[PDB]
């Protein structure tokens, strides 16, 4: 049976929902954006924002809101899975220890009826009385909320009305009451009512309000001074509070549809709006006072307040400071000013936040011919369309290219003292010397100083008193503004060679064979203070600038020959703080010091590629366990830097990491470069800051940017983007755009704003036009936003916009692909079009066109005019397959630059989706399901091999290994199906078998090939998906020997990880579609495996029982080798 | 709403969740129930005539249990188009046939046979 | 993969000393073996028409000849490779198959007829189906059924040259139906084209081999019949 491997590589991006209140802290305001399964835990300073403890859960958040109930100092979270599984959260905090409580939860839900329409609905009551949940159309789920709910109970009181597209709650009125927007079947209105919870039953209501707006879509309750309800629609806005009423008709919102709103002031004074295109309204309320103490309102004034993201979240903070919160690209935290500018525009842009939200096609490639390939994925929507590229490590790239390998060391010489300015450098080879230059990317050689021009230098750094170290045979010096006779040269009293020596900017720490020497800098004197001996020979010296920015450290390091040394002085005095001698012949490069925020650790650089995980209290002298992580075969090098700021810290070795952070967590991150040996950080004229890397190849001056794992580069063209190809003969990508324009009265077409479309560097527009013989194109009144699409050919390196080919009127862009077809060297874009109309059913038109790019210019071979919509294409060894309206197409290339087609099917609903490995076609079916399709060559034409029945309405399918196939649903699952082994007839070898369940909780859009780590030449392939919320994972085949030790021990942890919300992770995981509950088997959840690196082992302990291990072997499993098949797994992601 | 078109109910729904939005339900359902095509005939060539009353499937689909006016229900492979087994169940004709879930029971109603 | 595109070649007479039962006794074989197109494509593109018009016309295989041209362009497109070779390969085609609907055949009208029921959606087959007689050769099929002589519908009783000519005359409707909406469209192109003249219309016209008859008597039919009121 099939097995198989899921883990997370990106996390979510896309926001849902952004709740504010006082979660962490009772005088604190706060920040809650849920993404996917995400509860993201900010808070807010003054400066923006800072996060403070992120929590997973099993379950789509869709519904949250905060309330504070009436016993509680600070407040409490509600959040309601998409699996109707409650939950009431608590925060609790004690020191460092940041821990959530559930404190009741209960699955509330029904065996029978349909679920919703609009999603689901919920509202608390401003008393904190009742919660309100719209679940199962026709019933209204009320929770009664008490302290006597350890778990929820549940009301179901009936709504007589049936279709309701919006409710909410009104304030303060010493009763808990209810709106509504019902559609009538002769009309629609909005009703009220009021719920008495010790009654279960629906009381007379205050308002009647028999009818109202057309397309009333939102109500917006306003507070307890002047309480009522808006009831804002598509074209204009009311107010009622049962007696008076009134009604504006503002010419602002005339071209967009209000989707999101806030309470700004407290006392409900000002509201915030938004649009389904990007604007910013603001809602302006004229408080009267009518007597001394009679509210009223007495007008309505809607601002236009400027161009923002697409809006889903909307959460007025402090100080003018609103953040914008975006599923379709780029969530992000703007500021309102007082006066205006040029467009009027109070906003005020500040940093942005990273989404990738919807991605409709990718495709793994690697720009560079590593092992490592990049991803290129299409993300956003209307006018946030935008390429995000995702890699791996980290991009050195800005690096320049100095041809000096194997060298030793590079150690600055200035003469400026209060810049860094005119800095030349030491070249420091082993018995030979130069003085170094750097004029920006290029270098210089000269002799400047005159005392190392003659012999070899180890290390040389910044004195802080203006003053630098020279070490030349044996002996230390000072150095005035550089001069050419010595300041202060303390000789040694042994007149040997220097073993290994180190400097630092106010002291100077030389080891000669096994005595170790310590210099006091004055100012133009060195003075003996301390000194100690070894008992083996230093193998190495490290010094690190721990405090005070000024080079007294209060540790120290030694390594010793063939001798593993972890002995600890106090440097300054040399006093002995921890003595530990692990013994070997493994040579360390003796300890890196750097506090990672948190702790400080001891960093040992073994020899042949080995690491310690060591962690040192700075007064006490207690070390933690020590960990074996492998780096390569070469002995390793650690060290600590400035890139800008921050102290970046990276690890010179095999395998170069950075080892300082990742989402603020001690996990490695690669970079950009082969092998790294050393590192010197040089003075560049074009560099800021950067440093140079002394490697066993040239010498790369660059700096390093914000550390991550996945860096994510955005190139922005401001429309929705379709799908992604990839040419390697030409260097260049190609995108399928969507613009929505309105038609204008005397012109054709007009657009709205100017995105990356019109501003191509060559245009052009479809010739041929072959629709012409259909009268279909009927004249339409007014411009009602038509979508114009048109092929996009993006630069390999610059990435700008090469060619634009507008299409035909209402022709989409649905497939594309690039290949070669045929004995035509030639490698083209092929692009399977269709006419579209609304007010129209499927449609019965279209045409498939293939282009080339000879010498950049895009060119329209042949066309080929197709009854039917061309949705799914795949080269299939020199033939293009297409999928044809429920009718499997394949076609040939003639060298009359035609088509021909070849072979037909007819025995589908709707064919969508189309995946080729070999000789095998898998055809995703729309409803019915996993279809595979043989292909004869001998015969030439198609044949059934097996065809499942079960009716799931498939989502996304690829081949796996042309045994087992993997298919997605609409309802957010797995399966694979596998092909049937037993042929013992011929009814029993036509139908496929559903081997292993999994419910992914996530849309899946894409598949492809191609992993993201390097080539190092386990499991076996990989499987790349691509998604709604930015979640992109990886799906693998295991061994079955593998799946027994790993299956085992989901059920280990699913006993001890207490998840949030106390949901069982075998109930969560389990397919449930409307009609099937069937629990999951087959696939392998690695996000719950990969979690047990951050359990502690005295919880460690209780997961290893008495197991099983395979090293035909058997063995009792152990903590050690259990954590190693983890990172077994965690070295692919 | 999510449009007329199906094609734009695709593009809608990659971008948008399950369906394409509000109003994409039914939408599916008027544009795939609303077309059939016949399959293949089954007769009942034992008397050169076919006299069948009352047809349901099984609890697991594979075979369809017809109801003659002899008294007897016959089944029939859904994929070969040969007779398994008939049965002597009841003496008038058959009305009402059907069987459970969980693939044990099975209820067969006579005319006027004296067991109905 | 025993040869038989190879195999059936030699089986029809190439100026030999052939009966006539087994040479239309192999083409009722090869009219089942031309239902593949892989089979079909080969058979052209290695001359097998021209060799399958080497029949002297008074001949008792004329039967299997129609049927072997008759599955020739039932499913596969194959009469799109016809046109591209010597000129007067249609122009057997056109002097061969008009003759065998005037040879008057008990079911040579029974299949030949049937050929042009597709065939019409080419030009040139239209183009020479007028520089010949056309419909007087086809008209003189109706004007000479005797089930629709009423001066001697008493004569014939026997049920043989009865359901013959009933089921006659009920192909030439058919060969009459896409008949006219094929040159419904083609003066809709004389339409189109000389009375637009840009305003609406591109002309580019490269007289192609291209089926162009709008395929649908429920919508489309139906509406090329309403736009021809707009004409002179």
Redesign the interface.
């Known amino acids: 049976m099939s097995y198989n491997y899921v883990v997370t590589a990106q996390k979510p991006t896309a926001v849902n929902g952004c709740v504010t209140g006082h979660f962490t802290s009772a005088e604190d305001l706060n920040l809650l954006i849920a993404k996917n399964t995400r509860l993201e835990i900010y808070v807010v300073t003054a400066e923006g924002l800072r996060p403070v403890k992120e929590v997973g859960m099993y379950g789509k958040i869709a519904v949250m809101e905060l309330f504070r109930p009436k016993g509680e100092s600070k407040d409490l979270l509600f959040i309601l899975t998409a699996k109707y599984n409650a939950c009431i959260l608590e925060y609790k905090q004690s020191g460092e220890s940041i821990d959530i409580i559930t404190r009741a939860h209960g699955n509330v839900q029904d065996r029978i009826g349909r679920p919703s329409?609009?999603?689901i609905i919920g509202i608390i009551d401003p008393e904190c009385r009742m919660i309100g949940l719209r679940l199962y159309d026709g019933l209204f789920k009320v929770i009664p909320l008490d302290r006597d709910n350890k778990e929820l109970k549940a009301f179901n009181i009936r709504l007589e009305e049936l279709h309701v597209i919006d409710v909410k709650f009104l304030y303060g009125c010493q009763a808990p009451t209810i709106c509504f927007v019902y559609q009538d079947p002769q009309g629609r209105h909005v009703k009220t009512y009021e719920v008495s919870l010790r009654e279960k039953e629906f009381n007379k209501g205050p308002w009647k309000q028999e009818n109202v707006e057309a397309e009333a879509s939102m109500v917006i309750a306003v507070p307890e001074p002047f309480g009522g309800a808006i009831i804002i629609g598509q074209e204009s806005i009311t107010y009622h509070n049962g007696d008076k009423y009134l009604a504006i008709a503002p010419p602002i919102i005339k071209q967009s549809t209000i989707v999101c709103h806030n309470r700004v002031d407290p006392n409900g004074s000002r509201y915030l709006l938004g649009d389904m295109e990007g604007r910013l309204f603001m809602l302006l309320l004229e408080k009267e006072e009518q007597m001394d103490g009679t509210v009223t309102l007495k007008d309505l004034r809607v601002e236009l307040l400027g161009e923002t993201s697409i809006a889903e979240c909307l959460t007025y903070l402090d100080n003018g400071v609103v953040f914008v919160g975006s599923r379709?690209g780029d969530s992000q935290l703007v500021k309102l000013n007082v006066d205006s500018n040029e467009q009027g525009s109070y906003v005020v842009a500040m940093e942005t936040f990273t989404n990738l939200?919807?991605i409709?096609d990718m495709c793994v490639v690697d720009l560079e011919r590593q092992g490592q390939g990049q991803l290129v994925t299409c993300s956003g929507?209307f006018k946030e369309g935008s390429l995000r590229i995702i890699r791996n490590g980290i991009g050195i790239h800005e690096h320049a290219s100095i041809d000096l390998p194997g060298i030793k060391g590079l150690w600055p010489l200035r003469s400026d003292p209060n810049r860094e300015t005119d800095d030349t450098l030491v070249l420091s080879f082993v018995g030979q010397t130069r003085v170094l230059m750097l004029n920006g990317e290029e270098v210089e050689e000269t002799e400047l100083m005159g005392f190392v021009d003659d012999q070899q230098t180890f290390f040389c750094g910044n004195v802080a008193h203006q003053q630098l170290i020279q070490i030349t045979s044996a002996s230390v010096r000072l150095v005035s503004q550089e001069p050419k006779a010595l300041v202060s040269e303390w000789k040694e009293p042994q007149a040997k060679n220097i073993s290994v020596a180190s400097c630092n900017s106010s002291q100077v720490v030389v080891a000669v064979g096994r005595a170790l020497y310590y210099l006091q800098i004055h100012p133009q004197e060195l003075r003996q203070i301390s000194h100690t001996e070894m008992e083996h020979e230093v193998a190495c010296l490290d010094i690190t600038p721990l405090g005070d920015s000024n080079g007294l450290s209060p540790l120290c390091a030694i390594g010793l020959w063939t001798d593993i040394s972890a002995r600890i002085l106090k440097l300054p005095s040399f006093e002995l703080l921890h003595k530990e001698m692990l013994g070997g012949e493994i040579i360390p490069r003796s300890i890196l010091m750097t506090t990672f925020e948190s702790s400080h650790y001891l960093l040992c650089a073994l020899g042949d590629g080995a690491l310690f995980y060591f962690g040192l209290n700075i007064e006490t002298g207690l070390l933690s366990d020590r960990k074996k992580v492998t780096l390569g075969t070469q002995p390793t090098v650690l060290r600590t830097f400035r890139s800008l700021s921050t102290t970046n810290v990276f690890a010179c070795s095999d395998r170069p990491t950075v080892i300082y952070s990742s989402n603020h967590k001690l996990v490695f991150s690669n970079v950009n470069l082969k092998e790294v040996n050393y590192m010197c950080p040089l003075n560049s004229d074009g560099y800021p800051d950067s440093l140079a890397l002394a490697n066993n190849s040239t010498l790369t001056i660059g700096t390093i940017d914000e550390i991550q794992k996945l860096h994510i580069r955005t190139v922005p063209l401001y429309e929705?983007p379709?799908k992604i190809c990839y040419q390697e003969v030409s260097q260049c990508f190609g995108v399928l755009s969507?613009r929505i324009e309105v038609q204008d009265t005397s012109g054709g077409t007009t657009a709205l704003r100017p995105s990356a479309s019109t501003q191509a560097l060559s245009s052009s527009v479809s010739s041929?036009?072959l629709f012409?013989?259909?009268?279909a194109p009927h004249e339409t009144s007014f411009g009602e936003e038509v979508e114009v699409h048109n092929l996009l050919i993006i630069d390999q390196h610059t990435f700008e916009v090469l060619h634009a080919h507008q299409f035909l009127q209402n022709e989409?862009a649905?497939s594309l692909v690039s290949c070669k077809l045929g004995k035509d060297p030639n490698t083209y874009f092929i692009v399977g079009t269709?006419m579209?109309?609304?007010?129209?059913?499927?449609?019965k038109q279209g045409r498939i066109v293939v282009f080339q790019y000879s010498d950049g210019k895009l060119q329209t071979v042949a066309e080929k005019e197709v009854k039917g919509?061309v949705?799914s294409m795949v080269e299939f060894n020199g033939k293009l397959l297409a999928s044809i309206n429920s009718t499997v197409r394949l076609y040939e290339w003639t060298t009359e630059k035609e088509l021909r087609?070849?072979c037909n099917h007819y025995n589908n609903?709707?064919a969508?989706y189309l995946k080729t490995k070999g000789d095998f076609i898998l055809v995703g079916d729309?409803?019915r399901s996993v279809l595979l399709l043989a292909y004869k060559p001998?015969?030439?034409?198609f044949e059934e091999i097996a065809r499942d029945f079960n009716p799931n309405w498939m989502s996304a399918v690829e081949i796996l290994d042309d045994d087992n196939f993997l298919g997605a649903e609409?309802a957010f699952n797995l399966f694979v199906c596998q092909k049937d082994s037993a042929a013992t007839t011929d009814?029993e070898r036509?139908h496929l078998q559903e081997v292993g369940l999994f419910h992914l909780g996530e849309?899946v859009?894409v598949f492809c090939h191609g992993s993201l780590v390097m080539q190092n030449l386990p499991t076996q392939g990989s499987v790349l998906f691509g998604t709604?919320n930015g979640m992109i994972g990886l799906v693998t085949s295991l061994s079955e020997s593998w799946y027994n030790l790993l299956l085992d021990m989901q059920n280990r942890l699913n006993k001890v990880i207490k998840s949030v919300g106390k949901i069982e992770h075998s109930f969560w995981r389990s397919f449930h579609t409307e009609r099937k509950t069937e629990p999951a088997t087959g696939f392998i959840d690695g996000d719950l495996i990969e979690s047990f690196l951050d359990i502690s082992r005295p919880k460690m302990q209780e997961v290893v029982a008495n197991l099983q291990y395979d090293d035909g072997m058997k063995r009792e499993a152990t903590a050690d080798d259990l954590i190693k098949v983890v990172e077994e797994l965690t070295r692919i992601h | 709403q999510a449009?007329?078109?199906?094609?734009?109910r695709?593009?809608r729904r990659?971008?948008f969740?399950?369906?394409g939005g509000?109003?994409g339900?039914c939408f599916?359902r008027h544009?795939?129930f609303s077309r059939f095509r016949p399959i293949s005939v089954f007769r009942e060539a034992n008397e050169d005539e076919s006299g069948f009353t009352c047809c349901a499937f099984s609890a697991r689909e594979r075979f369809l249990m017809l109801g003659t006016c002899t008294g007897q229900l016959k089944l029939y492979?859904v994929?070969?188009g040969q007779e398994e087994a008939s049965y002597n169940c009841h003496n008038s004709a058959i009305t009402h046939l059907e069987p459970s879930r969980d693939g044990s029971l099975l209820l067969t109603s006579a005319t006027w046979s004296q067991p109905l | 993969?025993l040869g038989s595109r190879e195999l059936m070649m030699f089986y029809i007479d190439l100026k030999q000393t052939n009966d006539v039962l087994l040479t239309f006794e192999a083409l009722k074989h090869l009219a089942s073996l031309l239902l593949?197109?892989?089979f079909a494509t080969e058979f052209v593109a290695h001359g097998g028409v021209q060799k399958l018009l080497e029949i002297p016309r008074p001949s008792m295989a004329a039967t299997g000849v129609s049927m072997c041209l008759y599955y020739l362009s039932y499913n596969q497109?194959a009469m799109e490779r016809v046109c591209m070779h010597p000129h007067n390969v249609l122009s057997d085609v056109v002097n061969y198959t008009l003759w065998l609907m005037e040879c008057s055949h008990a079911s040579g009208c029974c299949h030949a007829t049937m050929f042009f029921s597709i065939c019409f959606s080419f030009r040139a087959v239209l183009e020479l189906f007028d520089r010949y007689d056309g419909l007087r050769r086809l008209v003189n099929l109706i004007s000479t059924l005797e089930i629709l002589n009423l001066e001697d519908q008493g004569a014939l009783l026997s049920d043989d040259e009865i359901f013959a000519s009933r089921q006659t005359g009920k192909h030439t409707c058919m060969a009459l139906r896409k008949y006219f909406e094929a040159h419904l469209a083609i003066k809709?192109e004389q339409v189109?084209q000389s009375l637009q003249r840009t305003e609406?219309?591109?002309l580019?016209h490269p007289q192609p081999p291209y089926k162009?008859c709008?395929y649908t008597h429920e919508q489309?039919v139906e509406?090329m019949e309403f736009?021809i009121e707009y004409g002179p």
């Open positions: 329409e609009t999603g379709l939200g919807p409709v929507a929705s379709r969507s041929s036009k012409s013989s259909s009268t989409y649905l269709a579209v109309y609304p007010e129209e059913a499927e449609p919509a949705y087609t070849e609903i709707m969508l729309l409803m001998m015969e030439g034409n609409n009814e036509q849309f859009n709604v | 449009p007329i078109n199906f094609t734009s695709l593009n990659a971008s969740p399950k369906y509000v109003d339900g599916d544009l795939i492979n994929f070969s | 993969q593949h197109n892989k497109d809709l189109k609406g219309g591109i580019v162009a709008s489309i509406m736009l």
